[PDB]
Design a binder for this molecule. Structure first.
Ligand code: WVY
Length: 167
């Protein structure tokens, strides 16, 4: 039993809710919140900008030190950093950004990072300003993640479309 509330169960291990991932993280304080990161951990907009804003820019400060030490992530890769006031840990995962021409096949590799964590609160990777089809992202999530994932979808219209079209 965990504290996630109001989710629709899609599969044995994948759950979905129309929710603001920031507000959801603040309420649940999950062990792991996933950020929709880029390789530079520049949290300017989308989910990343919103999560970083909620940390009063502490996420960005920590991220800049991480990059200065380690260099950029790979597309499809991840790193574990602090969850600040939102979660114990933040798993920064880089899905391919279609508006940069990145290969969508890398979306499966991106979701594989979730399997290193037993339970996660997450957005749909490569959705939103990353330019991929969220229906495709949900399919890859379900077919790749084996650990327990609680997906937060900000847009109610998109949420309803994702549920109604889910196979
Ligand atoms: O960026 C996102 C994710 C997102 C993904 C897809 C869409 N989308 C709309 C139409 C088509 N796709 C919109 C948003 O979350 C925004 C965050 C989360 C909550 C806190 N404040 C924010 O701004």
């Amino acid at each position: 039993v965990n504290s996630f509330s109001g989710y629709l169960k899609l599969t044995d291990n994948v759950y979905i809710k129309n929710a603001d991932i920031v507000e959801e993280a603040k309420k649940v304080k999950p062990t792991v919140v996933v950020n929709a990161a880029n390789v530079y951990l520049k949290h300017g907009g989308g989910v990343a900008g919103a999560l970083n804003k909620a940390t009063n820019n502490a996420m960005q400060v920590e991220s800049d030190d991480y990059i200065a030490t380690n260099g950029p992530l790979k597309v499809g890769g991840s790193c574990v950093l602090s969850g600040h006031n939102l979660a114990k840990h933040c798993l920064h995962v880089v899905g391919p950004n279609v508006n940069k021409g990145e290969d969508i096949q890398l979306l499966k590799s991106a979701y594989e990072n979730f399997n290193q964590h037993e339970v996660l609160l997450a957005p749909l990777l490569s959705a939103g300003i990353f330019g991929a089809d969220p229906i495709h992202s949900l399919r890859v999530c379900v077919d790749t993640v084996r650990t327990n994932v609680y997906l937060a979808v900000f847009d109610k219209n998109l949420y309803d479309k994702l549920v109604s079209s889910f196979l």
